[PDB]
Design an enzyme around this catalytic site. Structure first.
Site, short mmCIF file in Angstrom:
data_model
loop_
_atom_site.label_atom_id
_atom_site.label_comp_id
_atom_site.label_asym_id
_atom_site.label_seq_id
_atom_site.Cartn_x
_atom_site.Cartn_y
_atom_site.Cartn_z
CB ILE A 36 -1.03 0.03 1.17
CG1 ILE A 36 -0.36 -0.32 2.50
CG2 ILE A 36 -2.21 -0.90 0.86
CD1 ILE A 36 -1.23 -0.09 3.73
CB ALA B 246 12.98 6.52 1.23
CG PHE B 247 15.57 4.10 4.16
CD1 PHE B 247 16.88 4.03 3.69
CD2 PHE B 247 15.10 5.29 4.70
CE1 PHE B 247 17.71 5.14 3.76
CE2 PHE B 247 15.93 6.41 4.77
CZ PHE B 247 17.24 6.33 4.30
N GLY B 248 12.12 1.30 2.28
CA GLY B 248 11.31 0.10 2.20
C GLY B 248 9.83 0.36 1.99
CD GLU B 249 7.31 -4.17 -0.20
OE1 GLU B 249 6.10 -4.49 -0.18
OE2 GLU B 249 8.14 -4.69 -0.98
CB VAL B 250 3.86 0.92 3.99
CG1 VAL B 250 2.75 0.72 5.02
CG2 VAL B 250 4.93 1.84 4.55
CE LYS C 10 8.49 3.92 7.00
NZ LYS C 10 8.41 5.33 7.49
CG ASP D 230 8.74 15.52 5.55
OD1 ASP D 230 8.66 14.29 5.36
OD2 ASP D 230 8.65 16.35 4.61
CE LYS E 285 6.54 14.14 2.49
NZ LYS E 285 7.66 13.95 1.52
CG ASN F 210 4.59 12.63 6.08
OD1 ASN F 210 4.93 11.49 5.76
ND2 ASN F 210 5.40 13.67 5.98
CG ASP G 57 7.08 8.82 7.34
OD1 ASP G 57 7.26 9.02 6.12
OD2 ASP G 57 8.02 8.57 8.13
CB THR H 97 9.96 16.85 -2.17
OG1 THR H 97 9.62 16.34 -0.88
CG2 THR H 97 10.19 15.69 -3.14
O1 HFS Z 1 3.94 4.56 6.53
S1 HFS Z 1 3.03 5.50 5.93
O2 HFS Z 1 2.77 6.55 6.86
C1 HFS Z 1 1.67 4.73 5.57
C2 HFS Z 1 1.31 4.51 4.24
C3 HFS Z 1 0.13 3.84 3.88
C4 HFS Z 1 -0.75 3.35 4.84
C5 HFS Z 1 -0.48 3.50 6.19
C6 HFS Z 1 -1.40 2.99 7.25
O3 HFS Z 1 -2.45 2.39 6.95
N1 HFS Z 1 -1.07 3.18 8.54
C7 HFS Z 1 0.05 3.82 8.91
C8 HFS Z 1 0.97 4.34 8.00
C9 HFS Z 1 0.75 4.20 6.63
N2 HFS Z 1 3.66 6.10 4.67
C10 HFS Z 1 3.20 7.40 4.17
C11 HFS Z 1 4.31 8.42 4.42
C12 HFS Z 1 5.41 8.31 3.36
N3 HFS Z 1 6.36 7.23 3.59
C13 HFS Z 1 6.04 6.02 4.35
C14 HFS Z 1 4.71 5.38 3.94
#
Ligand code: HFS
Ligand code: HFS
Lengths: 400, 398
Positions: free
Chosen positions: B78, B82-86, B101, B194, B196, B199, B212, B233
């Site tokens: 979802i 940067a350093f990994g996926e969520v 995360k 940060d 935005k 977040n 985040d 950014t």
């Molecule tokens: O970790 S995230 O906060 C993030 C993304 C998508 C769904 C989430 C969710 O459902 N809960 C907490 C955090 C979530 N995020 C968005 C910020 C940019 N980088 C990290 C990914």
């Protein structure tokens, strides 16, 4: 399950015998900080950042955990090999103990044993009135610390040197050793170093086995496979002494041989295999068939000689080969002042008269102080000298 | 202190979640020391070989019993970060749904930036605020860090602005929820740095939560912070943080309020106020904000909205929010007849999401796929210690 695992993890965080309990984990971190805090290692960013990240944390830990300056040293009561034993009073609780120091650098300087694990395990868990009890075990970057109970009555070496031991006394002390070694055997160990140096008397004058450095676990058939000899020249058995790389396979009979040597010395005043030099004792031990003689003195009863000779023979015929109960049934022990099951409840032959809780009159005087001895040389690369002592601490997870 | 106290203070530390010496943190230092030593070159030393030989059996069983990656069933990716996926995950045992995360240990070490996660872990786990995305579990292995957060099914504000021409009533609501959310972050003693729409996430009721916190920092005695980092950014980043490209400047919390002004401008105009084709162009326009900040030639945006945007988009010394958060709340832009500040998060949100199941990921765009294998560590000939910066990261909840 999500809870079974939470519980099984908690059993490993609490169990006083878990290699990963609170004591072992607090040690593991403590060892790392010690083995990284060197300028030559601080050059690595990871190592440097980690130490500064934990600097304030690790200090609060070392201040809360049991340390050396928590104890007030009253007097040094023994020294040599790998450290010293000193009568200490806990500054906070005012309780009096005998603390044993072990030099980490000295033990790593070729000792080939890691013997302290056996000694820590027995003294802390034996739960026997015949075994000197361990209360606390802690450490730093230089010494191991074993906080044992104080034995104000002194050792048996001191007793034999100040008294011409009569048979009544000898019978008592031999019987207390027999029961003490039987308790050690029941735990699954062969002592391998039974001697008056290791026998300590309490405030009532009753015997306890102290120092289990040479102890080894018995196998299924109750035997030990060791290629190198262990013990003391005077008290060592023929089979443990000759024990070669060929096999070196012996039972608990070696402990009973040493009891016979102990009995002989109490009555005669000399070791049964004494010689001019150390190497002479050796030839006499291997030649126990012809070297074992009693000096012409009519004071050693028939039964005393009988028991000594029953213990001082070859392993195959030696008394105690058929269990401990045949040693107890011996006529030498036949008396009218005590019974085996009630022996440690009777009045001892020498009740010590003590002035205070710190009366060290039964221990020969020593200088103390020394002058902070040499430890490990400052590493140029990561060595990990504190790793072989991780989990030695007995403080946070002890049995009650 | 007595012996009973010195013992019990120590014994409480091993069960305190806020402690660096807690049971989970100590298990890390041992789990880490095994990984950073189990190499044939270092096995030459007996002190190391004898250590690994003993804690062999123990450290494996420990690794299997503790919370690990395969305890979770991944439903769908979802987000990329940067350093990994969520990824939306369901806990195999409890069947509870979370957003996990991942963070690549090697990737972090590669490009420095390997200490930012502490601030994020500390906030999300202890904030205990309805404005903060909650951390439930934090665990790790030899390669990735894992942050098990609460799932936000409403999606982010980027997705919302792209699907709606945001009216003022909505903008007022979402701005006010950010103001309160950032105020809660400031109260903990942090500057977000940060802020935005990426977040800002919405829950099942469509209410805002800050997610985040990878760039948050602890304020010093005067409530300020020094910093020096290559900014990513600059769109929402303030002039002061931009003028601090090397620790050559201290800034307060007013840099967060600037970002709120950029956030409000974007919701109403549809574009960032200092946008440019190149990254250096955005920066140049932010520095020259005194002359670059303009409004479209259609008075769709009201007077108060312009007033608030301009109050947030000025120099730190005159910027709104310098004299506290209460003067931002007292602004006429927030003057409405639908809600009050103290009862705002109890009112009905402008966009309440309609969810099909507990795993309805309709508010999240489909992610492609890296199709790229992750880089590993080279086998060390010495002690590099590439696990020490990630010791004490493990966190559980009761
Ligand atoms: O970790 S995230 O906060 C993030 C993304 C998508 C769904 C989430 C969710 O459902 N809960 C907490 C955090 C979530 N995020 C968005 C910020 C940019 N980088 C990290 C990914
Ligand atoms: O550690 S000792 O068992 C030892 C010596 C003196 C007093 C003690 C005491 O009081 N309690 C326990 C052990 C003691 N010991 C005797 C064996 C030889 N080496 C170490 C010193």
């Amino acid at each position: 399950s999500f809870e079974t695992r939470f519980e099984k993890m908690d059993n490993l965080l609490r169990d006083p015998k878990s290699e990963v309990n609170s004591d072992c984990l607090l040690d593991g971190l403590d060892a790392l900080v010690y083995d990284l805090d060197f300028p030559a290692l601080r050059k690595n960013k990871n190592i440097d950042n980690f130490l500064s990240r934990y600097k304030d944390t690790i200090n609060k830990i070392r201040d809360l955990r049991m340390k050396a300056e928590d104890y007030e040293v009253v007097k040094v009561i023994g020294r040599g090999a790998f450290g010293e034993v000193q009568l200490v009073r806990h500054k906070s609780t005012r309780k009096v103990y005998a603390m044993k120091l072990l030099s980490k650098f000295e033990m790593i300087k070729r000792s080939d044993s890691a013997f302290f694990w056996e000694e820590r395990d027995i003294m802390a868990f034996a739960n026997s009135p015949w075994v000197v009890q361990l209360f606390y075990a802690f450490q730093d970057d230089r010494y191991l610390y074993m906080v044992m109970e104080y034995m104000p009555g002194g050792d048996l070496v001191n007793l034999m040197s100040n008294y011409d031991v009569p048979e009544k006394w000898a019978r008592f002390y031999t019987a207390e050793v027999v029961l003490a070694l039987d308790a050690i055997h029941s735990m699954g160990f062969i002592h391998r170093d039974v001697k008056p140096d290791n026998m300590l008397l309490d405030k009532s004058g009753h015997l306890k086995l102290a120092d289990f450095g040479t102890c080894m676990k018995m196998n299924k058939e109750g035997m030990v496979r060791c290629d190198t000899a262990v013990g003391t020249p005077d008290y060592i058995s023929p089979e443990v002494l000759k024990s070669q790389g060929g096999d070196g396979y012996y039972g608990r009979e070696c402990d009973w041989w040493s009891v016979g040597v102990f009995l002989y010395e109490m009555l005669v005043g000399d070791t049964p295999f004494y010689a001019d030099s150390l190497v002479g004792t050796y030839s006499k031990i291997m030649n126990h068939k012809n070297s074992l003689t009693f000096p012409d003195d009519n004071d050693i009863s028939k039964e005393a000689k009988n028991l000594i000779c029953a213990f001082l023979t070859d392993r195959e015929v030696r008394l105690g080969r058929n269990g401990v109960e045949e040693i107890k049934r011996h006529l030498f022990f036949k008396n009218d002042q005590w019974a085996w099951e009630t022996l440690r409840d009777t009045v001892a032959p020498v009740v010590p008269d003590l002035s205070s809780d710190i009366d060290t009159s039964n221990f020969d005087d020593l200088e103390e102080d020394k002058g902070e001895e040499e430890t490990f040389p400052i590493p140029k690369a990561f060595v990990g000298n504190q790793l072989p002592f991780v989990g030695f601490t007995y403080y946070s997870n002890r049995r009650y």
